[PDB]
Amino acid sequence: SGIVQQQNNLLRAIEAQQHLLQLTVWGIKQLQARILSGGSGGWMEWDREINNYTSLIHSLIEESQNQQEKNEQELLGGSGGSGIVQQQNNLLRAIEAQQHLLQLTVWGIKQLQARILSGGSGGWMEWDREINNYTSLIHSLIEESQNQQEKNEQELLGGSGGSGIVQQQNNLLRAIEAQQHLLQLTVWGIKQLQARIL
Amino acid sequence: XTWEXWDXAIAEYAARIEALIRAAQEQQEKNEXAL
Numbered sequence: 001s002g003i004v005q006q007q008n009n010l011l012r013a014i015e016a017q018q019h020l021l022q023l024t025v026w027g028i029k030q031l032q033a034r035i036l037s038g039g040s041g042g043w044m045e046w047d048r049e050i051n052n053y054t055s056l057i058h059s060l061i062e063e064s065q066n067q068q069e070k071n072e073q074e075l076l077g078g079s080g081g082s083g084i085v086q087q088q089n090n091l092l093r094a095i096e097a098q099q100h101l102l103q104l105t106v107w108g109i110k111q112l113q114a115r116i117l118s119g120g121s122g123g124w125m126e127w128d129r130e131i132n133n134y135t136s137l138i139h140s141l142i143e144e145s146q147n148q149q150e151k152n153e154q155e156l157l158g159g160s161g162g163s164g165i166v167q168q169q170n171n172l173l174r175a176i177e178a179q180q181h182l183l184q185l186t187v188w189g190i191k192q193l194q195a196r197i198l
Numbered sequence: 199x200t201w202e203x204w205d206x207a208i209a210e211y212a213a214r215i216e217a218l219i220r221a222a223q224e225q226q227e228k229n230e231x232a233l
């Protein structure tokens with residue numbers, strides 16, 4: 001349905017992934033109050049950094065929403081390759097912030113799991129691998145998106161960069177897909193811990 | 199029974215995300231029409 005409209009869907013995916021993630025954060029805090037005694041072992045910092053990246057992503061989503069309206073208002077002017085490219089930068093930044101949050105939730109689930117369950121049963125060894133795999137995959141897609149972004153910002157000045165833009169849509173989409181797998185892995189982990197200890 | 203609320207909210211964002219990704223992918227395979 002056109003790049004601007006697809007951008008709207010990526011943004012909506014990102015926002016819905018952030019609500020899902022905040023639900024995982026809630027799950028983790030419930031587990032943390034049963035299993036741990038205070039902010040030792042990195043937990044005070046975990047709480048602080050959950051809050052800091054949440055506030056950053058809220059702010060990136062608000063900026064992407066405003067850029068989205070602007071791009072939609074100017075669809076008939078034809079001219080905004082730079083608006084589309086700007087929105088690609090915004091979405092990438094949001095994805096990166098989401099990924100920091102995801103890595104914090106992964107770390108939390110791991111720290112809690114280590115205290116109450118062996119790492120060697122119940123799907124946990126596969127979980128560890130899948131977490132590692134998707135984290136590597138997401139990092140690779142983020143790196144590729146950063147490189148594509150720099151390239152697109154260059155091509156737009158010259159002849160044109162329509163192909164680079166479509167490729168970047170693909171990059172961002174795949175990153176969001178991979179992050180959804182990671183999110184689903186974190187939901188699984190939380191449910192195992194909840195079944196065990198609550 | 200909040201956790202089964204929680205597990206509600208998760209599955210019904212999850213369904214929304216899957217729909218959005220599917221729609222964006224089936225936009226992407228139009229973008230690659232444009233290319």
Ligand SMILES: [Cl-]
Nearest residue numbers: 012013016214
């Ligand atoms: Cl939506």
